[PDB]
Design a protein around this ligand. Structure first.
Ligand SMILES: *[B]([O])([O])[C]([C][C]([C])[C])[N]C(=O)[C]([C]C1=[C][C]=[C][C]=[C]1)[N]C(=O)C1=[C]N=[C][C]=N1
Lengths: 233, 212, 222, 240, 235, 244, 204, 231, 195
């Protein structure tokens, strides 16, 4: 049993016709203090998987090392390490899920919420969640922390069920994700303007975008708001 | 829960209710609270549903192993002490059990042992165990004799459970009867309390407080 | 302080027919007042014509199902590909659950299938491994809503024959698979209306001598 | 720990360490067991090479395992103490858990099991001891007499002997013991036991020990004078 | 000296091959399997007439549906029987059913090669394990200290084994009745035994679906011995 | 591997003897003779130190006679270092018994415990046995004055009079000749010394070559005293008995 | 609840001219219930005397433990243990149970047999040594004993005078404590004679 | 000679005699064949009986839905090694949701056997194994030796008289590798291959033991009247 | 359980122990014997937490019986009491201590004296002319302080014991369903069947 110290906030994600998109901001909070402003919380594994992590950052860095080691281990005595016997999204997830549930079972959890996004060998979209309790679930859209409350409602208007996935393009999907990140910046007190985004497509592969910023923000209306009720000046 | 067992001329009568509850919610009315350990041994269940089931079926495995090794039926004393010594090892861990181990051997005759999760092991003639044990005791103590017929003894057990089923909120469903002789136990049916209450009320003239 | 348990909601329902058995469950998965997934399968074909669901804390549910599936596999290896009977499966699951008596799997387990006489069978468990064969059992969040309805409409409880006035009971005539599916669908429609953790979709697994079939029905998504 | 396999098979299918343990038994002082109709008697040889002995305090050859069972032996004395101690502990353990004293067959089976275990465990040698276990089961009047040996095999005997010159006294018993009609009384049973030892012992003075066990935990050891009277009567009948 | 788990130049484990020689010195045990049941019989071989022969226990119950006969260093068999009984009962506890005869035998044979420098040497005893289950019916297995087990229609082990096996080769067919099998075991035991066969120095047993595993009384066997004598004198 | 160098200390010979026990007894037969004689009013322990020197400090020396508690003492024959290991174990066992039952340990129970330890080294562990034989002289309120002996096999026996170490065959014959049951301590003192004086391999028996001890009820009223004799006291008792 | 005051009791020790004195009450109780009036708290191992207050089961256990150790000491050393040396042994033995201690308040008293010098010493429940020239106190009425000793005591008191001083110190201190009393014993100790006196006191 | 007392001792020429003696136990064992095409992989095994009353000893063991092996030598050692494979296949599935690669299964068997050849007290395994399987890189056939050496092959045979079947496969290499989408013809080629190792005895209904695994074919074993088709 | 008493007179020790067993609300039994014979001339009564009492008593019984067989000799009451004390003193610092209080009544055949030892669950031993555990002493000790004289007969002891039980039956709230009385003397242990 511990308490989380340096923490990361929401991770958000969704499926689209030819793949999956995932995003998370670059902040490492220390309670209410916005301590570290250059923290990468999306961690790619090969050219077919991206693991998004929220919660305790020391535990995140531990998980990051486990994944790095997993790649090294898979390559051992494996001539098809960059082909048929490469690491799949499903393999990487199931491994993490196993660890998370084992650690909770020893009453010493990795204090995180994790989303594994990727594309499988047969082109199938992979998107699944796991957290400190070892709880897992999949959905056309997945989000952690505040994202669960604010992002999912917006992303579910694009892809409400399974049949909406082929009808959703990558342009429409990215647009929805970027908007969700703006909304989280308006409303989450432990978020930052700077974020990273990752697309994994079955055709065009893994596109990793860094140093993105929330833009097109509405603040002008604030000038007209005066007092808390009766005040006119 | 109301479970009883008593020694008499014709052997042992065992009677139990069928109700299982989680708070105020009635989880099951069809619970088998008598465990058939072998053709000669019965165990009653009260307290933790799982603890009792698990460790009393386990007891049957230890009894089978005894008679495979010793070429002889296990004594009620030995069988009961295997269970009590086991639960004593777990004392403090939070097991919840109140059980009667009932049997009939040549050397002992009809024998009943009260075994309990605090480590208590008691030999006796009459025992009532469970939330509705006080209600069942009332009927038993006033009507019990050594010289009861198998028919009258069976009814007294049935009636004592009915008494507790009525008053105790955590007892009810149905009544399972067993009669234990030296050649083994004999099952005497499932009796729904919904039908048994009205039947007994009419025939016995009892429960004049209730309208029917 | 760290709490190793959680509640993922959901509800499940097993009914045993004369020569068949169904095990249904809603597809919604939740924490607190949020939906995690509208379609997260909860009932599983475990092989040997046995279907299983472990409702409650999903992480413990998935662990248990995973370990039972594993037990079926090793049963085949160790006993010359012998079919694991439903009664044998039930006893094995008791030991899986009781093995963690002092740090329990936080689930309500139900399995369904056919017994060795071909007749429909449903078994029900508590979190620490006690079990009992039943004709009818609902489990999980809305179990208190569904069970009474099933006492009335499956076992004809408190029902009697017209003209006799409480003297003659309604006879316990057998229910077809079509008739049971009707009762399952209505049970979940009703449960969805009045329970916030039930909804999105209903998935039913039917078990017969021919094998394991699946049916899916939409439920209200609010 | 010392794990060396001392008891192992040989090309001809023999375990020599177990067989050499039997040779240690052959060296030991003679012990004999005879069961009558309502009693069992255990006779034992005391070698008279050791005088200036204190017979009050010297370890007696027959040992009580419980109030109703006794154990005598032939072979290494020091080894026998270890088996006796274990047997005494198991006897009290049985009473504690089963709420009933051990049967003679059970106690034998336990002692025999210990001996067997020492024939296929690493770092240990077999016991150089064969035992005669005798007594009466609880609430039973049928006499019991069992034998064990280093290999761990055990069996029941109407009458049996072990130790040095046991071949001779077994020869005596085989012609003198009738199964259809065993020694009906205590006197007859003791007499036959003393007779069998007199085939081997030397002097009938302080060289013979006799212990009589009867039903319901009735065990007594005969004194020098009491045994000496049996020795006197046997030879006076023999002078004819 | 040399390792306990050492291979010979021919590719055989020295200790296993030497334990087989100990089994050849043991008393004879015979088993015959039929569609009506499986019969098990043994030579008691008392070393002296003062030894009460009924205390010689070479046929043993493992469960209601599984019996067992032994030959060789019979003291070694006690921990094997204890394991077998535990395995049979434990499986019933875990699965609420009888355990397959083959699965029981496999569990016993798993102990065999657990020796080294675990126990210090292999078992010096062979076992005939007979039983019935719903899947494969009436069965007879031969469990060696090598860890190997063969199923048999009929099988003899011990000192008079190769002579008995040759006799079982000619006599066994698929339509044998239980009565015919009882007499056949007695006939072959009588042939290979040193002393004259009677109810006190030989023991019979069987396993049927209905009645389970039973050791035959000395009175019951005595009648079957008398029935055998008469039918041999009949031609 | 290591098997190659293993002597296998705990095995039977083809004749059914324990090699190492037999050889340990051969070692003990060269050790200085120790004698124990039990009387009605006490027990005597006499023992010969092995070929000493004039430059050995005798008054502070102890190789033969050791005190286990206030009621029990032992005479040693064999490896002194091995004996001290066992002696310290015996001293502890006595104190464990006293703590548990609040009574002084009965002599036989102490003797059985030490003898069981010796036995263990002959059956398991692969170690060499202890090359020691003890004479136990002790008193308790059950059996009174008692003499025991134990040897490397772990076998023990009770005695009226007994010798261990060198020339036991000759010593035991002499003791068997002159010992009587109604004997007293003063007489037993004389017998012990006379027996050593005849069996000794030395030219003459002197005070500097002996260790002597008595266990008497010759203590003021119903109680027992242990006396470990000083050099000058051994010299005086040698003159008194007429040996020097 | 507090282990050191379940049973009750006191011990006091003092020095004089070529002599030492140690005294104790005789009460053993179960909180308010008086159980025994013959529970002596002073023990001796040779010429070294040890008083022990506190939880009664530990008083008994430690006595048996130090008898054990002093008996082995004597066998190996071939001499009786001296007060100074015994004091160190008590300290060592208590501190080894640092985090699961015996709930006791031991007091040592005796005269060194070689130097002739009087010696007393006290300990807390975990081994700390207090080696006073004048006096040592212990038990449930230790505050009371401190007050009596500090006023009544003077140095170089003759054996018979010292008896009076230590007795009055104990008696009057015990009478102001509910869990002490029910009889008392005083030991006067000279180089080669030790007198033991039981005191007549109020039995409430 | 002086260097064959235990496995921890090299000979003066650098040989490990205990390992070589374990290799000899395989040669005494009954013949078993393994071959594969691009779609399927087959095992054919001649089972051996004790006598006419006895059953024929089983040669083939299933390890997973996609992997299994045939044995030759000490059967209990095959049970130990197959049990280890079963666990490793199972660990890969439960932890990584991944079917264990046949090549990696060979690497694990190699390393397990090796530890028994370098330590005092233990002994080498006395059995040879032929592992077939279908994974993400198609059909596979492996040959395991208890020295630790594992080899991937198109076809092979081990046991007594295995040289005859091994030569036949060496001739037929170009033909049977092309047998794609035709399980019956691939088994025919395996049955005809094992026939080159028979003397005196022929393939009967309770003698023969066949196993197959492929693209849309789980690892199954055929015995009894199920192989009468191929006799 | 509840009330256990003991009194040592001229030539014997008398133990009295209640018959009731109560689990919570109900009295399950009214004929329970809260004692075990350790040896022919030594008897131990006990009271404490459920289960622990019998488990501890039988465990001590087994150990003493083992000693008797091994040495063919009966331990003195003093020796047995010291053994029991040590077991409890060991127990009190265990993971889960024995919650048991005992009285040990024996007759020493060597000294020809009766002996009564009171030991609590902490391992606190005292030899006494009369003793009790729990709240029993609170009512009975004042009577025993007045009437006891060390030279009483066994009959005078039983009368003084009846006066103690009568006081308990008057002033104690709990119904302990009477007592089973046992006497320990030179001839061994016997039960007074009418009390
Ligand atoms: B009975 O009420 O004691 C009954 C006996 C049991 C063997 C069926 N126990 C229960 O009903 C208990 C609750 C309880 C009620 C009253 C007294 C004591 C205990 N129920 C359970 O243990 C339980 C466990 N899981 C699900 C439902 N019920």
């Amino acid at each position: 049993t511990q308490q989380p110290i340096v923490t990361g906030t929401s991770v958000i994600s969704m499926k689209y016709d030819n793949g999956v998109i995932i995003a998370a901001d670059n902040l490492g909070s220390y309670g209410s203090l916005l301590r570290f402003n250059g923290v990468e919380r999306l961690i790619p594994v090969g050219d077919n998987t991206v693991v998004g992590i929220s919660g305790d950052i020391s535990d995140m860095q531990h998980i990051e090392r486990l994944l790095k080691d997993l790649v090294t281990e898979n390559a051992y005595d494996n001539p098809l390490a960059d082909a048929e016997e490469a690491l799949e999204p499903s393999y990487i997830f199931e491994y993490l899920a196993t660890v998370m549930y084992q650690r909770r079972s020893k009453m010493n959890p990795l204090w995180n919420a994790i989303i594994v996004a990727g594309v499988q060998s047969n082109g199938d979209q992979f998107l699944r969640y796991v957290n400190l309790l070892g709880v897992t679930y999949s959905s056309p859209t997945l989000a952690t922390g505040f994202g669960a409350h604010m992002a999912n409602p917006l992303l579910r208007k694009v892809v409400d069920r399974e049949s909406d996935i082929p009808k959703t393009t990558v342009q429409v999907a990215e647009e929805a994700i970027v908007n969700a990140m703006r909304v989280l910046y308006y409303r989450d007190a432990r978020s930052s303007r700077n974020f990273s985004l990752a697309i994994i497509d079955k055709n065009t592969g893994l596109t990793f975008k860094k140093n993105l910023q929330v833009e097109n923000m509405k603040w002008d209306f604030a000038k007209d708001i005066k007092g808390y009720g009766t005040q006119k000046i | 829960t109301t479970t009883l067992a008593f020694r008499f001329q014709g052997g042992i009568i065992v009677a139990v209710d069928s109700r299982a509850t989680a708070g105020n919610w009635v989880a099951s009315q069809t619970v088998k609270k008598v465990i058939e350990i072998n053709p000669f041994l019965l165990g009653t269940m009260a307290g933790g549903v799982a603890d009792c089931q698990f460790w009393e079926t386990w007891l049957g495995s230890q009894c089978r192993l005894h008679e495979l090794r010793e070429k002889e039926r296990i004594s009620v004393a030995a069988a009961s002490k295997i269970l009590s010594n086991l639960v004593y090892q777990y004392k403090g861990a939070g097991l919840s059990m109140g059980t009667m181990i009932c049997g009939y051997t040549r050397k002992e005759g009809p024998t009943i042992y009260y075994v309990d999760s605090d480590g208590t092991r008691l030999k006796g003639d009459i025992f009532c165990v469970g939330s509705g044990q006080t209600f069942a005791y009332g009927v038993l103590d006033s009507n019990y004799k050594w010289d009861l017929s198998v028919e009258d003894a069976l009814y007294l057990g049935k009636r004592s459970i009915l008494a507790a089923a009525h008053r105790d909120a955590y007892s009810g469903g149905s009544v399972n009867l067993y009669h234990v002789t030296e050649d083994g136990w004999i099952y005497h049916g499932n009796h729904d309390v919904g039908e048994l209450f009205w039947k007994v009320k009419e025939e016995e003239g009892s429960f004049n407080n209730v309208i029917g | 302080q760290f709490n190793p348990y959680g509640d993922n909601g959901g509800t499940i329902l097993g009914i045993a027919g004369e020569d068949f058995a169904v095990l249904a469950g809603d597809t919604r998965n939740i924490t607190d007042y949020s939906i995690n997934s509208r379609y997260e399968p909860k009932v599983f074909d475990c092989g040997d014509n046995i279907v299983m669901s472990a409702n409650g804390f999903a992480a413990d549910g998935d662990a248990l199902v995973k370990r039972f599936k594993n037990s079926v596999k090793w049963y085949h290896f160790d006993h010359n590909d012998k079919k694991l009977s439903i009664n044998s499966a039930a006893r094995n699951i008791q030991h899986l659950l009781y093995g963690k008596r002092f740090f329990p799997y936080y689930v309500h387990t139900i399995i369904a299938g056919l017994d060795e006489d071909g007749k429909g069978a449903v078994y029900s468990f508590d979190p620490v491994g006690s079990y009992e064969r039943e004709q009818c059992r609902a489990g999980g969040a809305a179990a208190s809503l569904i069970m009474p309805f099933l006492d009335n409409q499956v076992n004809f409880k408190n029902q009697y024959e017209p003209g006799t006035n409480g003297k003659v009971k309604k006879p316990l005539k057998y229910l077809s698979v079509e008739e049971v599916i009707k009762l399952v669908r209505d049970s979940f429609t009703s449960a969805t209306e009045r329970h916030i953790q039930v909804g999105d979709g209903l998935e039913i697994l039917i078990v017969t001598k021919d094998g394991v079939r699946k049916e899916f029905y939409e439920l209200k998504r609010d | 720990g010392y794990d060396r396999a001392l008891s192992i098979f040989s090309p001809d299918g023999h375990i020599f360490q177990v067989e050499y343990a039997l040779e240690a038994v052959k060296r030991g002082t003679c012990a004999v067991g005879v069961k009558g109709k309502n009693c069992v008697v255990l006779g034992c040889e005391r070698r008279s090479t050791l005088k200036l002995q204190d017979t009050r305090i010297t370890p007696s050859k027959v040992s009580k395992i419980d109030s109703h069972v006794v154990l005598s032996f032939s072979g290494l004395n020091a080894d026998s103490r270890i088996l006796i101690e274990k047997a005494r502990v198991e006897a009290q353990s049985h009473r504690l858990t089963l709420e009933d004293p051990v049967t003679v067959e059970y106690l034998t089976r336990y002692v025999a099991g210990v001996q067997q275990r020492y024939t296929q465990s690493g770092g240990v040698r077999p016991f150089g001891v064969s035992t005669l276990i005798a007594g009466f089961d609880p609430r039973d009047d049928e006499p019991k007499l069992y034998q064990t040996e280093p290999s761990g095999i055990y069996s029941s005997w109407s009458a049996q002997t072990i130790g040095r010159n046991s071949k001779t006294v077994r020869e005596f018993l085989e012609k003198n013991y009738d199964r259809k009609e065993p020694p009906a009384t205590v006197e007859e049973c003791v007499k036959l036991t003393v007779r069998s030892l007199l085939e081997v012992v030397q002097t009938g003075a302080k060289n013979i020990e006799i212990t009589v066990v009867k039903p319901d935990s009735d065990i007594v050891a005969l004194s020098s004078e009491e045994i000496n009277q049996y020795v006197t009567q046997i030879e006076q009948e023999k002078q004819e | 000296d040399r390792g306990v788990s050492t291979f010979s130049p021919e590719g055989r484990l020295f200790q296993v091959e030497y334990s087989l020689e100990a089994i050849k010195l043991g008393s004879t045990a015979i088993g015959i399997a039929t569609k009506e049941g499986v019969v098990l019989g043994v030579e008691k071989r008392a070393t002296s007439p003062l030894l009460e022969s009924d205390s010689i226990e070479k046929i043993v119950e493992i469960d209601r549906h599984i019996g067992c006969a032994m030959s060789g260093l019979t003291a070694d068999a006690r921990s094997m029987i204890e394991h077998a009984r535990t395995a049979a009962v434990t499986h019933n506890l875990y699965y609420d059913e009888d355990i397959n005869v083959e699965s029981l035998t496999q569990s016993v044979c798993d102990l065999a090669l657990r020796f080294g420098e675990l126990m210090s040497r292999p078992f010096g005893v062979a076992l005939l394990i007979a039983g019935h289950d719903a899947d494969d019916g009436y069965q007879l297995f031969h469990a060696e200290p090598s860890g190997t087990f063969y199923r048999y229609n009929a099988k003899a082990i011990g000192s008079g084994s190769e002579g008995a096996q040759a006799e079982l080769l000619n006599e066994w067919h698929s339509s044998l009745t239980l009565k015919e099998a009882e007499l056949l075991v007695l006939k072959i035991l009588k042939q290979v035994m040193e002393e004259k066969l009677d109810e006190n120095n030989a023991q019979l047993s069987c396993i049927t679906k209905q009645d389970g595993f039973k050791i035959y009384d000395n009175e019951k066997t005595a009648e079957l011995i008398k029935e055998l004598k008469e039918k041999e004198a009949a031609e | 591997g290591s098997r190659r160098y293993d002597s296998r200390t705990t095995i039977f010979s083809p004749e059914g003897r324990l090699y190492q026990v037999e050889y340990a007894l051969e070692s003990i037969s060269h050790a200085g003779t120790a004698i124990g004689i039990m009387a009605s009013d006490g027990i005597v322990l006499a023992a010969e130190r092995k070929v000493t020197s004039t430059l050995l400090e005798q008054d502070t020396s102890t190789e033969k006679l050791y005190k286990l508690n206030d009621k029990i003492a032992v005479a040693v024959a064999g490896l002194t270092a091995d004996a001290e290991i066992l002696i310290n174990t015996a001293r502890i066992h006595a104190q464990n018994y006293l703590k548990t039952y609040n009574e002084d340990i009965p002599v036989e129970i102490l003797v059985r415990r030490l003898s069981d330890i010796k036995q263990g080294y002959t059956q398991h562990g692969g170690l060499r046995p202890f090359g020691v034989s003890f004479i136990y002289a002790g008193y308790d309120d059950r059996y009174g004055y008692q003499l025991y002996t134990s040897n490397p096999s772990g076998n023990y026996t009770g005695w009226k009079a007994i010798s261990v170490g060198a020339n036991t065959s000759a010593a035991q014959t002499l003791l068997q000749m002159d010992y009587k049951d109604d004997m007293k301590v003063d007489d037993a003192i004389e017998l012990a010394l006379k027996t050593l004086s005849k069996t000794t391999d030395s030219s003459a028996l002197t005070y500097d070559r002996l260790e002597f001890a008595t266990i008497r009820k010759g203590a003021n009223d119903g109680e027992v005293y242990q006396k470990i004799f000083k050099p000058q006291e051994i010299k005086d008792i040698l003159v008194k008995t007429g040996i020097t | 609840s507090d282990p050191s005051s379940i049973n009750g009791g006191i011990v006091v020790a003092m020095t004089g001219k070529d002599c030492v004195a140690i005294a104790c009450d005789l009460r053993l109780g179960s909180q308010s219930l008086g159980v025994s009036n013959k529970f002596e708290k002073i023990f001796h191992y040779g010429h070294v005397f040890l008083g022990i207050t506190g939880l009664a089961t530990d008083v008994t256990t430690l006595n048996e433990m130090f008898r054990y150790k002093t008996n082995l000491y004597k066998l190996k050393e071939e001499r009786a243990i001296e007060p100074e040396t015994f004091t160190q042994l008590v300290s060592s033995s208590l501190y080894e149970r640092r985090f699961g201690p015996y709930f006791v308040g031991p007091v040592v008293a005796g005269i060194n047999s070689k130097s002739g010098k009087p010696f007393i010493a006290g300990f807390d429940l975990i081994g700390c040594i207090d080696e006073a020239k004048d006096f040592i106190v212990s038990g449930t009425a230790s505050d009371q004993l401190f007050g009596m000793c500090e006023s009544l005591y003077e140095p170089n008191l003759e054996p018979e005078d010292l008896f009076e001083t230590i007795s009055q110190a104990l008696l009057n201190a015990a009478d102001r404590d509910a869990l002490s009393g029910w009889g008392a014993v005083v030991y006067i100790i000279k180089k080669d004679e030790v007198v033991k006196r039981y005191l007549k006191m109020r039995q409430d | 000679n002086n260097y064959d007392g235990d496995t921890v001792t090299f000979s003066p020429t650098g040989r490990l005699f205990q390992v070589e003696y374990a290799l000899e136990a395989i040669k005494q064992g009954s013949v078993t064949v393994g071959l594969r095409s691009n779609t399927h992989a087959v095992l054919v095994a001649l089972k051996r009986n004790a006598d006419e009353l006895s059953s024929y000893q089983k040669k083939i063991i299933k390890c997973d839905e996609h992997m299994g092996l045939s044995l030759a030598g000490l059967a209990p050692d095959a049970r130990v090694l197959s049990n280890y494979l079963r666990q490793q296949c199972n660990y890969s599935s439960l932890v990584f949701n991944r079917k264990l690669a046949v090549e990696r299964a060979g690497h694990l068997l190699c390393d397990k056997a090796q530890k028994n050849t370098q330590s005092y007290g233990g002994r080498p395994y006395g059995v040879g194994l032929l592992i077939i399987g279908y994974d993400k890189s198609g059909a596979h056939l492996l040959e395991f030796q208890p020295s630790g050496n594992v080899t991937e092959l198109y076809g092979t045979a081990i046991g007594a008289r295995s040289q005859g079947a091994k030569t036949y496969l060496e001739r037929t290499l170009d033909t049977f590798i092309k047998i794609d989408g035709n399980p019956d013809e691939l088994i025919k080629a395996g049955v005809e291959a094992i026939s080159q190792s028979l003397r005196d005895e022929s393939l009967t209904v309770d003698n023969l033991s066949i196993a197959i695994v492929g693209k849309d074919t789980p690892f199954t074993i055929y015995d009894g009247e199920a192989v009468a088709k191929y006799i | 359980m509840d009330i256990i008493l003991g009194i040592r007179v001229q030539d014997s020790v008398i133990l009295a122990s209640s018959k009731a067993v109560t689990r919570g609300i109900s009295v399950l039994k009214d004929s329970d014997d809260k004692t075990r014979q350790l040896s022919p001339h030594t008897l131990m009564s006990f009271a404490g937490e459920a289960g622990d009492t019998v488990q501890f008593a039988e465990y001590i019984q087994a150990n003493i019986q083992l000693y008797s067989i091994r040495e063919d000799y009966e331990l003195s009451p003093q020796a047995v009491s010291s053994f029991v004390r040590q077991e409890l003193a060991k127990s009190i610092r265990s993971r889960r201590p024995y919650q048991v209080n005992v009285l040990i009544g024996g007759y020493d055949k060597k000294k020809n004296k009766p002996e009564l030892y009171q030991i609590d669950y902490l391992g606190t031993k005292v030899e006494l002319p009369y003793g009790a555990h729990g709240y029993s002493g609170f009512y009975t000790f004042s009577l025993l302080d007045h009437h006891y004289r060390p030279d009483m007969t066994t009959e005078e002891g039983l009368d003084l014991l009846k006066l103690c039980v009568q006081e308990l039956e008057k002033r104690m709230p709990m119904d302990f369903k009477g007592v089973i009385v046992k006497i320990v003397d030179k001839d061994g242990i016997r039960q007074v069947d009418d009390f």
